[PDB]
């Protein structure tokens, strides 16, 4: 017997003490070594209720990543309201590593194993674990990168899909590589992201068909964000310590959902020195980019969407979203919850 409960988890990782890479440095001090032989066991006949949207595991991870970024990517100049914070801002080694979250004695983590579990409600095939899988604390908007994949069908996650105010997390079952590059020796800030238009469009078609299941076979339309901060109108992410802003207009291109658009999609990108902080703490200023080839190849494993709505309309329009980085952690922690003995 047990009950739902919240407790201070501890983290584990395979961080290396010799590394100057900032995730390794944080994890070396914050986390314990992983268990080379962890204990997972199926629970014979147990049905437990999960709620990914009300999971305190998400809050703790958010706090850790904020802590990590505070120590690792401190800006040259931080502007928060009416103050100006100057700090050393040397170029550093930046490449996220997987972080496991673990329960202390007296608690355990229940893991949902239903193949098409959407994140809320009952789970019938349940197991208990010591720790979560390795989760890379990748901070991004619009596109979820380097995450896990859904095992069976594409999964549409939402607190309430009929409520258009609630964010949508699309969990892909096949990843699409996005190859971002700031080339070396005009504009040192000019970059670009390359995607296999054939792989992407086919996945986007699958996402469309999956959305039709939930929305009465209505026409599914994709549109770019109509406006707002650059960090959410663009695909915002950090590559090798540099802050990228990529235009995803071409990714959400309904024409390819048969014109000959099976080629390479090249998204225009920009590295910015001045950014709005996802932590909510004003704006940050960094030094101009390092010299040479800046390159990050990532797996697109999920998508953040908002639905326009409309009282009756024949279409449903979706736009890339994100900005609340807690949802990034939710897309990985959705199948876990803490209980007390």
């Amino acid at each position, epitope marked *: 017997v047990w009950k739902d409960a919240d407790t201070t988890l501890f983290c584990a990782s395979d961080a290396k003490a010799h590394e100057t890479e900032v995730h390794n440095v944080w994890a070396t001090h914050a986390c314990v070594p992983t268990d080379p032989n962890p204990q997972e066991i199926h629970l014979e006949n147990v049905t437990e209720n999960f709620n990914m949207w009300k999971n305190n595991m998400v809050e703790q991870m958010q706090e850790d990543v904020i802590s990590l970024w505070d120590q690792s990517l401190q800006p040259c100049v931080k502007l928060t*309201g009416g103050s100006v914070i100057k700090q050393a801002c040397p170029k550093i080694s930046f490449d996220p590593i997987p972080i496991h979250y673990c329960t202390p004695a007296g608690y355990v983590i229940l893991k949902c194993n239903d193949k098409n579990f959407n994140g809320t409600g009952p789970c019938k095939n349940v197991s208990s674990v010591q720790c979560t899988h390795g989760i890379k604390p990748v901070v991004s908007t619009q596109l979820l990168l380097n995450g896990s994949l859904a095992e069976e069908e594409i999964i549409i996650r939402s607190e309430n899909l009929t409520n258009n105010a609630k964010t949508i997390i699309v969990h892909l079952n096949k990843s699409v590589e996005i190859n971002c590059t700031r080339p070396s020796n005009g504009d040192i800030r000019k970059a670009y992201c390359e995607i296999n238009g054939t792989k992407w469009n086919k996945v986007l078609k699958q996402v469309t068909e999956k959305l039709k299941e939930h929305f009465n076979n209505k026409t599914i339309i994709f549109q770019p964000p*109509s*406006g*707002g901060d650059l960090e959410i109108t663009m695909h915002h992410f950090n590559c090798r310590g540099e802050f990228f802003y990529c235009n995803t207009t071409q990714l959400f291109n309904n024409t390819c959902i048969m014109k000959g658009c099976n080629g390479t999609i090249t998204l225009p990108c920009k590295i910015k020195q001045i950014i*709005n902080m996802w932590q909510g703490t004003g704006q940050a200023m960094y030094a101009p980019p390092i010299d040479g080839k800046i390159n990050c190849v990532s797996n697109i494993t999920g998508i953040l969407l908002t639905r326009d709505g409309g009282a009756n309309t024949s279409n449903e329009t979706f736009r890339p979203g994100g900005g609340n980085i*807690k949802d990034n952690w939710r897309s990985e922690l959705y199948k876990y919850k803490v209980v007390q003995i």
Partner: antibody
Amino acid sequence: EVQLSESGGGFVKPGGSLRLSCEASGFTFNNYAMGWVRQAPGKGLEWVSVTSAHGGSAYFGEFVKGRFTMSRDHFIDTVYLEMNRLTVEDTAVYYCVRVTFYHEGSGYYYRAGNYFDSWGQGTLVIVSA
Amino acid sequence: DIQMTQSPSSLSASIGDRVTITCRASQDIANYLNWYQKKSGTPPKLLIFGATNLHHGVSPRFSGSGHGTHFSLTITNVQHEDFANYFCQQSFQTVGSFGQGTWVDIRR
């Protein structure tokens, strides 16, 4: 219950500067974008400015043309609108507004698709020589 | 950039009437449209957001409709408190903008 209280209104010479403030209470200030709307005598409502929750970005109506500045102080839940190079046409009642988004999920970032759910009583700015 | 044009400029109504104010955007703004009421002496009051959603506390005698460029606000069973100036507002672009207003006065 949401409460917005403006101050800093009064008289100012054309070409002069004037800062409005809005003290907010009854909600979590750090979570919401905040803005300003004005109405000049005999005219309609006019979109002046909004600043994101994180306070690192602000956007302005077309008439502003680089003259105004916003800032927010999270220690005292106050939003500011600094107005410079004012003209007689800027004479108006200025309203502090709270901004709510149609959609959750943007966190502290400002996004299009929003509405002014709560309004202050407004404060009168008179630009005259 | 986006101009909001309301029609008519003004209209008269009796208690109990139903009136409709229309709002046209110079370009597509989906359902990103809000409606406000303004009476002298008091600040603007939100009525409708997202084209069709009635704001909490507002009488359901108010309803909004439209999607794209053409929108309307309908006031059913007009009451004395409804005699006011009404404004539409797009929030589609980063910078929003208001319509020029439509006022409703008492027919005689």
